[PDB]
Amino acid sequence: TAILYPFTISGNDRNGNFTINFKGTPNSTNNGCIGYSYNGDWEKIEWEGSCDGNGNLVVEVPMSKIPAGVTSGEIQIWAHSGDLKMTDYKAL
Ligand SMILES: OC[C@H]1O[C@@H](O[C@H]2[C@H](O)[C@H](O)[C@H](O[C@H]3[C@H](O)[C@H](O)[C@H](O)O[C@@H]3CO)O[C@@H]2CO)[C@@H](O)[C@@H](O)[C@@H]1O
């Protein structure tokens, strides 16, 4: 089953990286997306990654991938070999 976390951002500020911290099973395989509505339609930026030996995975997507005017959307986990939860996100 997919796991969805809503996010909210400034509509205008596009400095730096959309940075998501995940926590889960050491060395697990994982993938998903960041998704949002734009011009009426849902668009998706995919991520994939393994948790390190400490159980940490940091996904960084450039804020410039998300068009301006977008204020919200969802962090989605599509598959996870072990445990995985989003601890937080931040534009950085
Ligand atoms: O692309 C294959 C991938 O898709 C997963 O399903 C996703 C969709 O890709 C999409 O991101 C969808 O977005 C929803 C969103 O959750 C919200 O409800 C919004 O209003 O509407 C959009 C769709 O218009 O979310 C699902 C996940 O629930 C899933 O099938 C993966 O296993 C698969 O690899």
SS3 letters for 20-61? EEEEECCCCEEEEEEEEEECCEEEEEEEEEECCCCCEEEEEE
10 contacts 91 by C-beta, under 8 angstroms: yes
Q: CA 10, 31, 6 angle in degrees (round to 5)?
A: 30
With tokens 């005017």, the residue in question is: 69
- Whole-angstrom distance, CA of residue 32 vs CA of residue 46: 6
Split into its structural domains, the chain has a count of 1
Atom from ligand 1 closest to the CA of residue 33:
11
User: Domain of 72?
Assistant: 1-92
For residue 21, the cross-strand partners are 58, 88
Q: How many CA atoms lie within 13 A of 79 on its CB side?
A: 3
Pocket of ligand 1 (CB under 6 A): 2, 4, 33, 35, 42, 44, 74, 76, 78
Residue of 76, 77, 81, 84 best suited for mutating to test ligand 1, as the one with most atoms within 8 Å of CB: 76
Method used for this model? X-ray
Task: Please choose, from the candidates 35, 21, 28, the residue with its C-alpha nearest in 3D space to the C-alpha of residue 85.
Answer: 21
Provide the resolution (angstroms): 2.0
What is the SS3 assignment for 1? coil
- Whole-angstrom distance, CA of residue 48 vs CA of residue 38: 23
